[PDB]
Amino acid sequence: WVIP
Amino acid sequence: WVIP
Amino acid sequence: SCIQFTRHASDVLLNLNRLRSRDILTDVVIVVSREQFRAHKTVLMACSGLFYSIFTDQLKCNLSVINLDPEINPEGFCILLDFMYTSRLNLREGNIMAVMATAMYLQMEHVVDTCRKFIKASE
Amino acid sequence: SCIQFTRHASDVLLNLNRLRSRDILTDVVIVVSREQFRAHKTVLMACSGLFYSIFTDQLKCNLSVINLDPEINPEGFCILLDFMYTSRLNLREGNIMAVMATAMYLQMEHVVDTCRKFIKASE
Numbered sequence: 405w406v407i408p
Numbered sequence: 409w410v411i412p
Numbered sequence: 413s414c415i416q417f418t419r420h421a422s423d424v425l426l427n428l429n430r431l432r433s434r435d436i437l438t439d440v441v442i443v444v445s446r447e448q449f450r451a452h453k454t455v456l457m458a459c460s461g462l463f464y465s466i467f468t469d470q471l472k473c474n475l476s477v478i479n480l481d482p483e484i485n486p487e488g489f490c491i492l493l494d495f496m497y498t499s500r501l502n503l504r505e506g507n508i509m510a511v512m513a514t515a516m517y518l519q520m521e522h523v524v525d526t527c528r529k530f531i532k533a534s535e
Numbered sequence: 536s537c538i539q540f541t542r543h544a545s546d547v548l549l550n551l552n553r554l555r556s557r558d559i560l561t562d563v564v565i566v567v568s569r570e571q572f573r574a575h576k577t578v579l580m581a582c583s584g585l586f587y588s589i590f591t592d593q594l595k596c597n598l599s600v601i602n603l604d605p606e607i608n609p610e611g612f613c614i615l616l617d618f619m620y621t622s623r624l625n626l627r628e629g630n631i632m633a634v635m636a637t638a639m640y641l642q643m644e645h646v647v648d649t650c651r652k653f654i655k656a657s658e
């Protein structure tokens with residue numbers, strides 16, 4: 405999971 | 409396009 | 413010896429979400445209490461262990477309407493349906509419990525994982 | 536304020552290809568001369584300007600069989616259909632002309648681009  |  | 417187009421999978425998913433917004437080729441309505449959500453069975457199966465089980469069933473595969481358990485929160489389902497079609501999860505303090513419970517019911521393991529990690533960090 | 540799961544789009548496409556291999560929820564047969572290819576209309580539209588035009592048409596959207604132009608090479612179509620479902624293109628010296636012509640007909644601009652660049656490098 406990432407900060408887009 | 410890339411070499412996978 | 414194949415070559416691969418890096419953005420292809422993302423581009424496919426973007427167009428599947430465009431089809432959903434325009435209601436093109438949607439073949440099922442998911443009923444969550446008083447709310448209705450139109451979707452493509454193939455996308456639902458691709459994202460969820462629950463829908464994969466439902467739509468491989470020789471009788472349920474032909475249903476145009478699926479009713480979810482009355483304990484399922486419509487907003488939680490909406491957030492997860494948006495995630496299925498975009499890879500983006502609108503996870504907030506006010507919705508995390510509903511999102512995690514819906515993800516457990518829908519059998520969306522990666523979403524359950526992250527909800528667990530976000531809750532653990534706040535305790 | 537969304538979070539994003541990097542591998543989600545690839546995971547969706549992998550499951551759509553699994554559905555194609557098992558012939559689950561396929562809703563169209565594409566006829567290319569003597570050969571037949573089963574597929575999902577939604578994936579075809581998401582990948583190809585030609586299929587996007589065909590399946591948004593108020594009459595063609597309901598057809599279960601689509602016949603392509605007799606000049607279309609079945610192997611070229613097969614290679615492009617595999618690409619649609621996997622992001623991988625089996626581009627070879629012996630098939631590049633057929634792949635590029637099929638990609639132009641199917642309106643798959645990124646494939647046409649690369650076929651053009653690979654041909655230019657050999658001249």
Ligand SMILES: N#Cc1cnn2c(Nc3ccc4c(c3)CC(=O)N4)cc(Cl)nc12
Nearest residue numbers: 457458459460461464520521550553554
């Ligand atoms: N054919 C086919 C096919 C269509 N969909 N699909 C799967 N869909 C699925 C099943 C379980 C889970 C998820 C997705 C996300 C998750 O957390 N669990 C799996 C397989 Cl093995 N195959 C297929």
Ligand SMILES: N#Cc1cnn2c(Nc3ccc4c(c3)CC(=O)N4)cc(Cl)nc12
Nearest residue numbers: 427430431580581582583584587643644
């Ligand atoms: N709704 C919808 C929807 C479904 N599919 N789709 C598009 N599919 C497409 C159209 C043109 C081209 C390609 C894909 C690859 C290419 O080279 N050209 C576009 C839009 Cl703007 N919208 C949609």
Ligand SMILES: [Cl-]
Nearest residue numbers: 520521522523
């Ligand atoms: Cl997931």
Ligand SMILES: [Cl-]
Nearest residue numbers: 643644645646
């Ligand atoms: Cl393309």
